[PDB]
Amino acid sequence: PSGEYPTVNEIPVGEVRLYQIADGVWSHIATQSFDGAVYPSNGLIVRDGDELLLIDTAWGAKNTAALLAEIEKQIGLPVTRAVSTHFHDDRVGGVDVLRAAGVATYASPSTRRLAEAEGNEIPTHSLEGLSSSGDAVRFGPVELFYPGAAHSTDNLVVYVPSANVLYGGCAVHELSSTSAGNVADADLAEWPTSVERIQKHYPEAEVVIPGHGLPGGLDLLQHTANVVKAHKN
Ligand SMILES: CC(=O)O[C@@H](C)c1cccc2c(-c3ccc(CS(N)(=O)=O)c(F)c3)c(C(=O)O)[nH]c12
Ligand SMILES: [Zn+2]
Ligand SMILES: [Zn+2]
């Protein structure tokens, strides 16, 4: 009831929340168990005329089915395309559910290769034009940007120009974060440089959404660089 952004202990595993970020922009929030602990994660929904563009799954098949049901209840427009912003399960787990619901699924070739090698679900379509740091391409109502290696080598960020919303995905941490999250596939040395590229490219961002946790403003970018430095040590 508070209308505040929902946190890990407020979402049972299997349920999905939506949160209105701006006109035609929502985040989606779900929770999942991994290695015996429970974590929240975010994705994005962007209105695309009378259709919706989805950014990232809800971290699992059941969660992603629940996401589609929540979208139908709260928005009532069809999801026609999805982009996964890197290869981990919190981004691609649920792609098979999307594909069986008629959603066209996309990711960079780097993400597709990494997902395949890991045994994770694989988006159908490859997004070219994103292989060099600083690259950007348009995809419906968003811009996709490859900042360089950070949380993962393939991580993409997403900008919604109509609303100045920057979806950082897992390359960006929330302000309360005290660690750099799951760093198994990260490049802690390159991460600050990749964040600097995001800061330079999107200086008018008004809302910044992390891959996990609460949205805020541009301060999330500098905070992320700071915590990555601290974790590395
Ligand atoms: C290899 C890989 O990453 O697998 C993915 C599916 C994965 C599994 C489990 C946890 C994470 C985290 C993670 C971990 C801790 C925190 C702080 S806390 N207070 O506990 O919530 C957080 F915000 C995010 C992340 C991420 O850093 O993006 N990714 C995760
Ligand atoms: Zn990840
Ligand atoms: Zn993540």
Question: Could you give the CA distance from residue 118 to residue 206 in angstroms, rounded to a whole number?
Answer: 35
17 in any annotated domain: yes
3 in any annotated domain: no
- Pairing relationship of beta strands 79-83 and 51-55 according to DSSP bridges: parallel
76 in any annotated domain: yes
Q: Ligand 1, closest atom to CA 213?
A: 23
Look up tokens 């660089």; give the residue: 225
152-181 residues labelled b (16+ CB within 10 A) or e (exposed): bbbbbbbbbeebebbbbbbbbbbbebeebb
90 is catalytic: yes
98 in any annotated domain: yes
Cα 57 to ligand 1 centroid, rounded to whole Å? 15
2 in any annotated domain: no
Alpha carbon 118 to its chain's center: 19
Q: What is the 3-state secondary structure (H, E, C) of the chain?
A: CCCCCCCHHHCCCCCEEEEEEECCEEEEEEEEEECCEEEEEEEEEEEECCEEEEECCCCCHHHHHHHHHHHHHHCCCCEEEEECCCCCHHHHCCHHHHHHCCCEEEECHHHHHHHHHHCCCCCCEECCCCCCCCCEEEECCEEEECCCCCCCCCCCEEEECCCCEEEEECCCCCCCCCCCCCCCCCCCCCHHHHHHHHHHHCCCCCEEEECCCCCECCHHHHHHHHHHHHHHC
Instruction: Of 32, 31, 78, 74, give the one whose Cα is nearest residue 52.
Output: 78
**C-beta of residue 34 within 8 angstroms of C-beta of residue 43:** no
Q: Ligand 1, closest atom to CA 40?
A: 21
- Pairing relationship of beta strands 142-145 and 79-83 according to DSSP bridges: unpaired
Question: Could you give the CA distance from residue 45 to residue 55 in angstroms, rounded to a whole number?
Answer: 6
151 is catalytic: yes
Alpha carbon 87 to its chain's center: 11
Question: Could you give the CA distance from residue 17 to residue 227 in angstroms, rounded to a whole number?
Answer: 27
1 in any annotated domain: no
User: Which experimental approach was used here?
Assistant: X-ray
Please indicate if the annotation marks 212 as binding a ligand.
Answer: yes
Please indicate if the annotation marks 90 as binding a ligand.
Answer: yes
Instruction: Of 172, 217, 215, 213, give the one whose Cα is nearest residue 196.
Output: 172
Instruction: Of 141, 125, 228, 140, give the one whose Cα is nearest residue 177.
Output: 228
91 in any annotated domain: yes
Instruction: Of 156, 152, 160, 104, give the one whose Cα is nearest residue 129.
Output: 156
Question: Could you give the CA distance from residue 90 to residue 84 in angstroms, rounded to a whole number?
Answer: 9
CATH of the domain at 205: 3.60.15.10
Cα 186 to ligand 1 centroid, rounded to whole Å? 12
| Residue having the nearest C-alpha atom to atom 3 of ligand 1 | 182
36 in any annotated domain: yes
Q: How many structural domains does the chain have?
A: 1
- Pairing relationship of beta strands 165-169 and 207-210 according to DSSP bridges: parallel
**C-beta of residue 87 within 8 angstroms of C-beta of residue 154:** yes
Cα 170 to ligand 2 centroid, rounded to whole Å? 6
Resolution (A): 1.1
Residue 109: phi, psi to the nearest 5?
A: -60, -35
| Domain of 66, in residue numbers | 8-232
Please indicate if the annotation marks 86 as binding a ligand.
Answer: yes
CB atoms within 10 A of CB 138: 10
Task: Specify burial of residue 150 (Cβ count, 10 A radius: 0-12, 13-18, 19+).
Answer: buried
Question: Could you give the CA distance from residue 30 to residue 190 in angstroms, rounded to a whole number?
Answer: 29
